[PDB]
């Protein structure tokens, strides 16, 4: 009333499954956009058919034109590489796609911005945090107005695996990853909990050890690589962290989720982006929530936004 | 495959909404029990209906006859007074009910140790916490498998006032609410939190204050009584908090919920139920959490626990 | 983004099932409206703190203000009485209540006019098919905004009715009946199907008898009195029918739903609502489907507008 | 309570999107069983963090071991080849698949019978009316207890393509294919509705023609074929068919879902498996409904099983 239009810019392993996913939760109507023929309408001919089996009443048309921007109320930019040539699925790391994608963000900016500059726009691409930026720069629209993937997607591995110990609901596992999604993500023990219940408690009742934590963290960090290895660049998992969040604004549900937002001072950082809980609602990014880190988490935190610095002087 | 069978026991305010969201989440086939004639058989047959609109397949039936009991896989106890004859609405007190329920408990134990020994318990009836124990003792099923209604509703209450003061996600806020379902119920400000962050975090940067708190707390221990004088004995949320107490079970959910359960020493109590973080899943009462309270806690923790004490003297 | 508004005009039994259904489903913010004092605000309280248990973000207030109103996306009004004082349950008859709600919508139509000529509105007081016509003129919205309840919940029953024959999945069962939702509504068993299939097949596989959908047919329309006389004026199904309209207008999926709408030729009837299906989506009325009746079923169709005409006359 | 057991044997691309379907459904614990090693561990570890993001609680392991089918609940079988080598997309045909496949089900069969023979099982691999009666043959299974996607898959399509011309529901509309998922489907127009109306009420109206519907039916026909060329063997409508399937059976729906299934009479037809409508519930294929179809119908009917048959003897 009216529908929500969504534009999925990248309909590749990621775009695939947020359109699936569109259509099961009956979000908004989908575009999938590719610079690649022919695939982008064959997907959205086939996601089309679910809308039967999910009672739902959702366009998916395929495109290769940037102007089907215009109207979007939601954009979702996964376009660029997984990998950099040369490279091995061991030595694979989200660094080496700086190169790879800077110029596709720069791009796809100025198409946002004349076609749809009050749309919600989240970025995906990696570097992540790095690209984000690049892309609002671009892009030209307001800072509660673009996010990038991160948080949500590293937390959701951190509580997984944790309540698989613990034998809870998922759910009802709660973790801060922050500072950057990439190797130096800054996990913060002291902020998990389990039912609301601090994670020290089932720590002192020998439930989950200290040192079982610390290889979950590892975990954690590792599940990207890990996945590479074993498959392929991870896209279930990202996409459902990203319909949570863009279903957080269209439906103005004003979820608290770790996305990379623009820091105004937060941790002592401006003028780049990091990933921290943030409120997602109709008006964007309702709330920047900045955790009261203490010394060590801070040179942690300060660690992560280093690397995102780093990379935008390469780029 | 073969659908469960929830057999509510009490069909009247409660009863009702509980039928309605069933069907809604196509749990199971329920049966609408209770002592007043046709009354259950008309709100069966209205929700049966609902089937249609909902995309479910649930029978709804009323009865009359307590061995409709056999097969049950959950029994959900609302049976019983909501006020005591005499008493105005402003006296209202949850005590009162005792001397009207203890033996409408007794006669429902006998018949579910009867018909079904086998089935998962959830006691609603005032004084809940006095009444679960009664109900355990007089159907002699297993510890893990009764439970009372306390914490999943006192804590909506807490957590929804709390949302909406600091604009997020109501179940964003997490809260716990122990020790009994009454005036003395604990409401432990240290185990609050929003978006797995501490609330103090929230009180630091003046988002709620300390005074603010204190009075969502008093709202919070009040709102029965409130809403008994605007309308009624609640009704909506208690069913809603059941469901979401029996879904857990049913589905193997593994959610952590406050609940009225057998103590073996927790807290220092034993023989006695009281309000508690535990684990449903398939084996009913998976987990029985105990909080780690500090001296202050506990003691108010002690006060909850003696109202029930009491209580349980005088049934 | 932002949520709709939703107004329930009748805070009664209808409107809290509708209230209870609107958080399950996180529709949009509601007001309970009704004339009655602090009982709508302890309904909405009890309802509110659903949200936490439903994962919803949907406000709940209570309201004896029709200003109210104002900002109203959807209206659905029940304002009005049950049943005619002076008469037995047993003479139970929607007619009876046309001089006791024909003021009330006269009422209320002024405030919609005033306060939010643009809402889509949906009204069940009975006897329904005059009362929407008499608010339709007196609140001036167009009409394609403007419907009553009747049809999905009249089809409700007998496709329930059939499905529990069958055995087979309510929602399988698809079923029209047009005309006016009272005695004299039209049963059209030449539009009953089963999976798609004519229900004819399945007679002639002595599947279901002749005899068997003639009593169907009966206990369909003697529904609401039946439930009276066990219990009370229905409400649960009601509701749920009334939601299931709201949602396909609020979410545009164009569901094609049977409801009293504005003939403006359709089966020779002009100047008077009557039920037929019609497709509802963002536009509110957005196509009126008119059922290619042949002889037969038109002369059933006639002696139903003739009561709605008769009773027009009495208002 | 206990959550089911599902093991998908077959990994691929249909498989993927089933598991990500079933954990936002929360239907059950997953399997992904493959021949290729590491990629099942890959997408299960992927899709096991989605369970936070859509509160859920289902288990999702990758498997190279066939005994992994012990436990098993319902089995889904997409095992297989998608394309037949030397084969143009242009020259895309199911009847190539068999040689390639024939093996594959009887090995597959062999793991089933030893290591859960009461599992409800689900075939896929194409030819799937040859491969679905071959899986029955060697797993030893009951005849309700085993079926072949088809005509959810097609009608869905059907469906869609009809509610877009006519902007309803795509739920909304109800149509029939049945005998084979092949060129030779059975797309019966006399079996069309429009929200439970004759579709050739709209085709009176003008609202859809004769010559549009026939446009329709080739494109339905074709729709493998035009998304192999475009992309490739289609996953995202199969899996979510599949899912529907598989949840009617877990959650005892009793939906009427077209699918092939074992014919003892019905068409003329026995010793042969062919699509037609059956109700799915608990006790698996709970009945097969034979349509009434005419002369003409029933010709088309036999030119499909034929070619069934006629690789039945190629196999
Ligand atoms: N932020 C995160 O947590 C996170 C998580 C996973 C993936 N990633 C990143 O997301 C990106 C996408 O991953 P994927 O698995 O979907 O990869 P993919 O290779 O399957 O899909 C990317 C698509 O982008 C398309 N593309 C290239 N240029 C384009 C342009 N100008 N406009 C539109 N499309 C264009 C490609 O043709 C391709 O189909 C990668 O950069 C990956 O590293 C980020
Ligand atoms: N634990 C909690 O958090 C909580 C919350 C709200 C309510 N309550 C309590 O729940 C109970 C039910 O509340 P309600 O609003 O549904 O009240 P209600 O009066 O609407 O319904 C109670 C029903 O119990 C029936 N009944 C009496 N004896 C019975 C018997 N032997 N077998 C079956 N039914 C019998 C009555 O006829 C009545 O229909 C009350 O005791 C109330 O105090 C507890
Ligand atoms: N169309 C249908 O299929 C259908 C189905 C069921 C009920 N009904 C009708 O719906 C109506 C409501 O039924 P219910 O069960 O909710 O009844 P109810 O008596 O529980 O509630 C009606 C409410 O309207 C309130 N009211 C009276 N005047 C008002 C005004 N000016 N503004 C706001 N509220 C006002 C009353 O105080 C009461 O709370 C009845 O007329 C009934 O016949 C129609
Ligand atoms: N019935 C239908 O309506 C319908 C619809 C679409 C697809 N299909 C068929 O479904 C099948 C699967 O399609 P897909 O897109 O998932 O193909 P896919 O190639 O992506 O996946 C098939 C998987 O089967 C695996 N496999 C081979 N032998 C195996 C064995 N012995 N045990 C377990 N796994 C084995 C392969 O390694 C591969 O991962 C194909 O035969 C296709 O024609 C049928
Ligand atoms: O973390 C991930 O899943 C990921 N996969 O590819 N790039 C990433 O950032
Ligand atoms: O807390 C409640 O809602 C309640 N209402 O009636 N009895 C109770 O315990
Ligand atoms: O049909 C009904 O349910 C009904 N109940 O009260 N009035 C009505 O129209
Ligand atoms: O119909 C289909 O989608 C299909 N795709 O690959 N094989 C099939 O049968």
Not at 109 to 122: D, E, L, Q, T
Not at 146 to 164: A, E, H, N
Not at 287 to 306: G, R, T
Request: hydrophobic share 45%; with cysteine.
């Amino acid at each position: 009333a009216p529908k929500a239009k969504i534009v999925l810019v990248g309909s590749g392993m990621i775009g695939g499954v947020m359109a699936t996913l569109i259509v099961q939760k009956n979000l908004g109507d989908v575009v999938l956009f590719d610079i690649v023929k022919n695939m982008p309408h064959g997907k959205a001919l086939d996601t089309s058919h679910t809308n039967v089996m999910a009672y739902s009443n959702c366009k998916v048309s395929g495109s290769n034109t940037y102007d089907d921007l215009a109207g979007a109320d939601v954009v979702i930019v996964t376009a660029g590489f997984t990998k950099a040539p040369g490279k091995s699925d061991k030595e694979w790391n989200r660094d080496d796609l700086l190169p790879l994608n800077n110029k596709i963000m720069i791009e796809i900016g100025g198409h946002i911005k004349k076609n749809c500059p009050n749309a919600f726009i989240i970025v995906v691409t990696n570097p992540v945090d790095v690209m984000v930026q690049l892309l609002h720069q671009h892009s030209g629209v307001p800072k509660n107005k673009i996010i990038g993937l991160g948080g949500v997607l590293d937390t959701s591995r951190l509580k997984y695996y944790i309540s698989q110990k613990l034998n809870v609901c998922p759910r009802d596992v709660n973790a801060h990853i922050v500072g950057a999604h990439g190797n130096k993500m800054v996990l913060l023990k002291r902020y998990i909990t389990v039912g609301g219940i601090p994670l020290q408690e089932f720590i002192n009742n020998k439930l989950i050890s200290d040192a079982e934590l610390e290889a979950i963290f590892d975990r954690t960090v590792n599940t990207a690589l890990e996945i590479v290895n074993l498959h392929a660049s991870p896209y279930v998992a990202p996409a459902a962290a990203i319909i949570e969040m863009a279903e957080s604004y269209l439906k103005d549900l004003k979820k608290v989720l770790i996305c990379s937002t623009l820091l105004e001072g937060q941790y002592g950082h401006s003028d780049i982006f990091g990933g921290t809980p943030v409120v997602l609602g109709a008006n964007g990014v309702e709330q920047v929530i900045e955790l009261q880190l203490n010394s060590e988490e801070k040179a942690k935190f300060d660690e992560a936004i280093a690397e995102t610095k780093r990379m935008k002087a390469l780029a």
